[PDB]
């Protein structure tokens, strides 16, 4: 299978060779988020997580309230059953038994290297569903479903506050920071300690601007390695890139994937993992020029640590 491309591997995260061999065999260009969550749950790295007598029976009961079911003709007798379900309880923000809370902390300690390896395997194959693993990576940091309200990321945003936001058509983090003092204090019925934690989050939440330059557009030759420059600007230089997350109990640094690809062909042409630590920065990507004709290409700038802060740009090329 490893006729894989070295230049299409963005990170240096590591796990056992056993797990890498298993992941490579288990993932394809059609893998879904649910498939990837299952595959991740099978990592031998989780064998250090406790599995007690009675846990499976307790997990079966818990599973009633979770949206995704464990694969049908697969034994529920291993730690993978626990990992698959507790990670969903994490996304759903279910209150857990103290003992399952302990196991969840142990699980979360191992997830970042594992999800990054999933991204790297898919991207090394040129598979655009690497972006599906990126979606899952975001959920693992903020502890929120990709189908739930993205405002849930902000500390102390309970159901009452979410409904007050809906009533005035406030939907994004940027809508929150745009609010006038009196309307802001109307919705944010929170204590002093709580308000400071909202403030910490909103000030650190990224707002990036994506541009590019492609030298000699509409004069490209098929097959030749082509360079493209990607620039990303922030309003001011960040004082630190330490991620604010209520739910992820370990230190995390803000990182981004820069992705070039073509949606209609489900193909990833190039990828790069970057830190946007400056007011402005640019990066050079290299790809093989596709066949003769018109192609619609997209650049994505995807954050590993927050939801709804990603940026994308589409453009047309003509290969002679």
CATH number at residue 67: 1.10.3380.10
CA-CA distance, 20 to 124, in Å (whole number)?
13
Asked if 310 and 303 count as a contact pair (C-beta separation under 8 A), the reply is: yes
CA-CA distance, 256 to 279, in Å (whole number)?
15
Please check whether residues 98 and 139 belong to one and the same domain: no
Please check whether residues 134 and 283 belong to one and the same domain: yes
CA-CA distance, 116 to 36, in Å (whole number)?
12
Please check whether residues 224 and 120 belong to one and the same domain: no
End of a domain among 76, 106, 125? Answer: 125
Spell out the SS3 assignment of 151-216: HHHCCCCCHHHHHHHHHCCCCCHHHHHHCCHHHHHHHCCCCHHHHHHHHHHHHHCCCCEEEEECCC
Q: Which of 83, 91, 41 is nearest to 66 (CA)?
A: 91
End of a domain among 100, 125, 150? Answer: 125
Please check whether residues 13 and 117 belong to one and the same domain: yes
Asked if 302 and 310 count as a contact pair (C-beta separation under 8 A), the reply is: yes
Q: Which of 259, 251, 258, 286 is nearest to 274 (CA)?
A: 258
Please check whether residues 268 and 150 belong to one and the same domain: yes
Give the count of domains, the chain. 2
Phi, psi of 3 (to 5 degrees): -85, 25
End of a domain among 125, 158, 177? Answer: 125
Q: Which of 92, 83, 96 is nearest to 49 (CA)?
A: 83
How far, in Å, are 133, 202, 276, 305 from residue 236 at the CA level?
A: 30, 14, 11, 19
Nearest-10 crossing angle of helices 55-62, 79-92: 40
Task: Give the HSE-up count for residue 121: Cα atoms under 13 Å, Cβ half-sphere.
Answer: 27
Per DSSP, the three-state class of 117 is helix
CA-CA distance, 30 to 141, in Å (whole number)?
24
Please check whether residues 306 and 161 belong to one and the same domain: yes
Please check whether residues 83 and 172 belong to one and the same domain: no
Q: Which domain holds residue 153?
A: 126-320
CA-CA distance, 168 to 241, in Å (whole number)?
32
Q: Which of 236, 251, 290, 299 is nearest to 272 (CA)?
A: 299
Asked if 100 and 51 count as a contact pair (C-beta separation under 8 A), the reply is: no
CA-CA distance, 276 to 256, in Å (whole number)?
8
Residue 282 structure tokens: 């640019």
Distance of CA 90 to the CA centre of its chain: 15
Which sign, positive or negative, has the C-alpha torsion 126, 210, 169, 182? Answer: positive
Please check whether residues 269 and 310 belong to one and the same domain: yes
Please check whether residues 258 and 152 belong to one and the same domain: yes
Report DSSP letters for 233-269, one per residue: E-SS--S--B---SS--S--B--EEEEEEEGGGTEEE
CA-CA distance, 65 to 77, in Å (whole number)?
20
Residue 107 structure tokens: 């699980």
Elucidation technique: X-ray
CA-CA distance, 320 to 302, in Å (whole number)?
31
Asked if 130 and 119 count as a contact pair (C-beta separation under 8 A), the reply is: yes
How far, in Å, are 76, 126, 195 from residue 266 at the CA level?
A: 34, 9, 43
The DSSP output letter for 127 is: B
CA-CA distance, 55 to 38, in Å (whole number)?
18
Resolution in A: 2.0
Helix H or strand E segment including 112: helix 98-124
CA-CA distance, 64 to 90, in Å (whole number)?
15
Residue 261 structure tokens: 């690809």
Please check whether residues 262 and 313 belong to one and the same domain: yes
Please check whether residues 81 and 99 belong to one and the same domain: yes
In residues, how long is the chain? 320
Per DSSP, the three-state class of 93 is coil
CA-CA distance, 83 to 49, in Å (whole number)?
9
CA-CA distance, 85 to 276, in Å (whole number)?
34
Please check whether residues 109 and 186 belong to one and the same domain: no
CA-CA distance, 74 to 199, in Å (whole number)?
46
């Amino acid at each position: 299978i490893s006729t894989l491309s070295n230049g299409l591997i963005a990170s240096h995260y590591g796990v056992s060779f056993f797990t890498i061999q298993s992941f490579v065999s288990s993932l394809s260009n059609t893998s879904t988020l649910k498939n990837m969550l299952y595959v991740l749950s099978t990592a031998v790295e989780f064998e250090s997580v406790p599995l007690r007598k009675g846990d499976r029976a307790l997990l079966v009961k818990l599973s009633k309230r979770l949206p995704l079911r464990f694969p049908e003709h697969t034994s529920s007798g291993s730690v993978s059953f626990k990992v698959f379900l507790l990670l969903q309880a994490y996304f759903s923000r279910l209150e857990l038994p103290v003992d399952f809370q302990n196991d969840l902390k142990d699980i979360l300690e191992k997830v970042v290297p594992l999800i990054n390896v999933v991204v790297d395997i898919l991207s090394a194959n040129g598979y655009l569903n690497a972006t599906t693993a990126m979606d899952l990576a975001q959920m693992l940091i903020q502890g929120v479903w990709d189908v739930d309200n993205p405002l849930r990321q902000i500390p102390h945003f309970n159901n009452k506050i979410l409904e007050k936001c809906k009533e005035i058509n406030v939907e994004t983090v940027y809508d929150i920071m745009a609010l006038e003092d009196e309307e802001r204090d109307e919705i944010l019925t929170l204590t002093d300690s709580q308000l400071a934690q909202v403030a910490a989050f909103v000030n650190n939440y990224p707002n990036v601007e994506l541009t590019y330059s492609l030298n000699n557009s509409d004069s490209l030759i098929s097959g030749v390695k082509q360079k493209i420059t990607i620039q990303l600007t922030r309003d001011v230089e960040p004082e630190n890139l330490q991620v604010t997350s209520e739910k992820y109990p370990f230190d995390k640094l803000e990182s981004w994937w820069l992705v070039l690809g073509e949606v209609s062909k489900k193909e990833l042409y190039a990828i790069k993992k970057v830190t946007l630590n400056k007011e402005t920065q640019q990066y050079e990507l290299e790809f093989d020029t596709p066949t003769s004709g018109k192609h619609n290409l997209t650049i994505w700038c995807v954050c590993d640590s927050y939801l709804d802060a990603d940026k994308e740009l589409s453009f047309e090329i003509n290969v002679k």
